Write a protein that binds this ligand. Sequence first.
Ligand code: CA
Ligand code: CA
Ligand code: CA
Lengths: 50, 50, 104, 105
Amino acid sequence: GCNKALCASDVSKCLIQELCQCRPGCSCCKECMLCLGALWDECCDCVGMC
Amino acid sequence: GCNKALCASDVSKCLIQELCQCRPCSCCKECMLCLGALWDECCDCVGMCN
Amino acid sequence: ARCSRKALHVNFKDMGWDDWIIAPLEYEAFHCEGLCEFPLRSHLEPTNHAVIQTLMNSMDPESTPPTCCVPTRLSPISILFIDSANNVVYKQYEDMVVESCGCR
Amino acid sequence: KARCSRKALHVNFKDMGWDDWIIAPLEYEAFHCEGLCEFPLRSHLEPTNHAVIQTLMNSMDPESTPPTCCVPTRLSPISILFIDSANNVVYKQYEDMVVESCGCR
Ligand SMILES: [Ca+2]
Ligand SMILES: [Ca+2]
Ligand SMILES: [Ca+2]
């Protein structure tokens, strides 16, 4: 579900910004989607937020 | 040189004891005490041969 | 398969330390081993440098090597031994047991 | 194959596809750690007691115990001017961006 070739750049962009680092057990679940933008559908599985 | 087969056990003994970790010198003598008879054959492993 | 903590049994006699360590004769230290590929999970609490290196390694592995799975948290154990001066010592040694692994 | 040491690593942001949100700098030297981690471990770098013991076991039987690994032990930051997810312009200092020293762990 995580296309590594398609999501490597943008997913890493949001990580170094300290986003997509919370766990759904949720606070950053929404700020993470904002950072990925159109790639949320194709890359949400890379961070387990869907 | 440093004989790894002959010095591995005893040299490591002195490292975890927080000895032989200074550079040339303060701990040069407490290190020699820990190696004992193996000082000649293992001083190069910690660069304390002077 | 990915970076994780695995078992590692330490036997002091096997290492030739039975001549100065009195007790314990063995303990579990564990070790870190596994792959460090994109994505690096936050369970790896990665440095911003590790994140970038993993990305470059994923783009062109021929040019950039991956990060490595190493211990990120360690706890101590107490040991009763004989020092180089023949004194008997009961000391707590730090960074002896692995508690968590991460890619760095 | 040299021992654990700090080696060059040039980071180009446009090459990584980050030129659309990072304004400056577009590139910087981040370095990386790579090399052999076998006995003896450089004792002046103060390796953890666990790394010391594992290295010993690896020296006793490398077939049964794997060696420690060469990773960064001290990282420094750099400042970056970028556009955050909210289209705000931000000048922030990013931590753990440049490697200053390597060590076996
Ligand atoms: Ca001798
Ligand atoms: Ca012995
Ligand atoms: Ca882009």
